[PDB]
Amino acid sequence: KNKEIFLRELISNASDALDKIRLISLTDENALAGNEELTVKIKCDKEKNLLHVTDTGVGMTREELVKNLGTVGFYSAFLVADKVIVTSKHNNDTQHIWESDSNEFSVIADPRGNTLGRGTTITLVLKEEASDYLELDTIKNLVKKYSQFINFPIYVWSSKTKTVWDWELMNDIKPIWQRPSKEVEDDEYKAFYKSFSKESDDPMAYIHFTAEGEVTFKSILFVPTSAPRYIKLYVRRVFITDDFHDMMPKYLNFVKGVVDSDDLPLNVSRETLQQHKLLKVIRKKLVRKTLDMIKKIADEKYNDTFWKEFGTNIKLGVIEDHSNRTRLAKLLRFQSSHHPSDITSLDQYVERMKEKQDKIYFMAGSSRKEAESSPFVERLLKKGYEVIYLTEPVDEYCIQALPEFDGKRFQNVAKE
Numbered sequence: 001k002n003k004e005i006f007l008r009e010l011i012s013n014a015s016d017a018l019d020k021i022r023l024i025s026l027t028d029e030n031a032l033a034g035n036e037e038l039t040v041k042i043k044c045d046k047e048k049n050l051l052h053v054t055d056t057g058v059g060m061t062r063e064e065l066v067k068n069l070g071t072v073g074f075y076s077a078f079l080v081a082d083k084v085i086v087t088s089k090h091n092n093d094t095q096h097i098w099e100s101d102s103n104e105f106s107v108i109a110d111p112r113g114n115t116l117g118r119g120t121t122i123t124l125v126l127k128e129e130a131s132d133y134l135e136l137d138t139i140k141n142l143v144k145k146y147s148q149f150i151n152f153p154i155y156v157w158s159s160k161t162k163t164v165w166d167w168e169l170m171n172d173i174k175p176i177w178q179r180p181s182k183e184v185e186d187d188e189y190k191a192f193y194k195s196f197s198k199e200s201d202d203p204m205a206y207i208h209f210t211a212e213g214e215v216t217f218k219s220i221l222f223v224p225t226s227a228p229r230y231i232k233l234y235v236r237r238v239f240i241t242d243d244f245h246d247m248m249p250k251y252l253n254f255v256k257g258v259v260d261s262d263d264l265p266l267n268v269s270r271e272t273l274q275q276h277k278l279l280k281v282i283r284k285k286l287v288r289k290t291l292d293m294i295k296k297i298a299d300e301k302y303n304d305t306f307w308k309e310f311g312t313n314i315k316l317g318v319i320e321d322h323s324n325r326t327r328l329a330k331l332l333r334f335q336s337s338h339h340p341s342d343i344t345s346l347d348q349y350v351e352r353m354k355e356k357q358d359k360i361y362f363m364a365g366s367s368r369k370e371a372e373s374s375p376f377v378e379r380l381l382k383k384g385y386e387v388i389y390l391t392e393p394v395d396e397y398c399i400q401a402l403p404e405f406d407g408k409r410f411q412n413v414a415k416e
Contacts, residue, residue, distance in 0.1 A: 008146040017057025034118030056119040059090035083125035089116035147171035207293035251316035359411035
């Protein structure tokens with residue numbers, strides 16, 4: 001019922017094959033000698049009932065083709081095809097052909113020899129009910145749709161008017177995080193987020209900034225709509241990794257998105273890159289702009305959505321991140337005696353204090369009902385003070401890591 005997905009899936013891998021050979025060509029001087037271009041080339045063959053999707057990517061050795069495909073949403077190609085033919089050429093091997101009707105497979109050396117130079121061609125023998133993917137206009141439309149966020153030129157063999165056939169580019173190789181913000185539509189920012197985590201729901205909030213200073217990088221970060229129960233780094237526009245975990249601190253692990261330095265050493269090992277001094281700088285900047293992004297959330301939306309998902313994170317942040325402790329404190333929310341259910345900020349608490357009250361009162365409990373029914377609060381409430389209810393186990397350690405807030409010291413009502 002959603003068969004078209006196949007072409008997104010094919011395009012998706014082509015891009016990863018292209019990203020793989022690129023990483024290689026950072027340490028390997030020869031990598032691209034087999035074929036100088038880095039492109040995805042899609043061709044129709046209506047008369048032969050075929051669909052080709054050719055990447056000048058990393059390619060596959062004979063041993064790889066057998067293992068990687070015989071023993072990756074990919075296989076979705078069988079939704080539209082009776083037979084799938086993978087013709088590949090890797091730098092460490094001679095050209096090969098893998099073919100399958102999904103009942104078995106066979107890998108033979110390519111009789112035509114090295115026709116590809118380097119890369120892969122996925123040839124689909126299309127089903128009699130998928131004859132619509134032979135039409136140029138259907139294909140262009142699909143390609144263009146799934147092209148949007150690919151950073152590698154995608155061409156389709158098309159006609160133009162007498163009749164001339166040629167490669168027609170389908171997308172903008174120019175990444176969106178490299179575009180000026182004023183020119184980026186809010187739809188795009190959202191799509192781009194979907195196009196690298198699926199779930200296909202708007203992100204709770206995105207920030208898009210270009211960093212000046214000790215290090216220079218463009219970036220987009222996102223706050224996911226639900227706490228998952230992550231960051232792709234690029235150097236001079238060349239994909240490097242996402243296995244970088246010390247990117248963000250622990251309490252901010254939920255953040256997703258891209259960082260695109262032009263200052264980092266491009267032609268290094270990922271070992272070397274990770275211990276690089278500039279990363280700790282790039283880290284600092286990202287946390288600050290994440291906490292900026294979080295601040296910018298609409299006041300109602302913050303208490304109702306964000307805080308429900310990531311409240312604990314923020315509470316953890318106050319504990320870990322001493323250098324942002326104040327920026328975080330202002331993001332904290334709690335229940336309090338001021339209202340049955342609504343959560344209140346610490347600033348909102350202060351605004352409400354009595355003139356000679358210099359202590360922020362809190363009662364710790366296991367649940368709200370426990371803490372509010374406490375005998376300690378009785379006198380405080382009756383004399384019109386407000387008491388914060390700490391009901392999560394992290395809360396008391398949060399508050400315990402917070403000396404003053406706005407010149408006010410905290411006070412455990414259950415204590416002297």
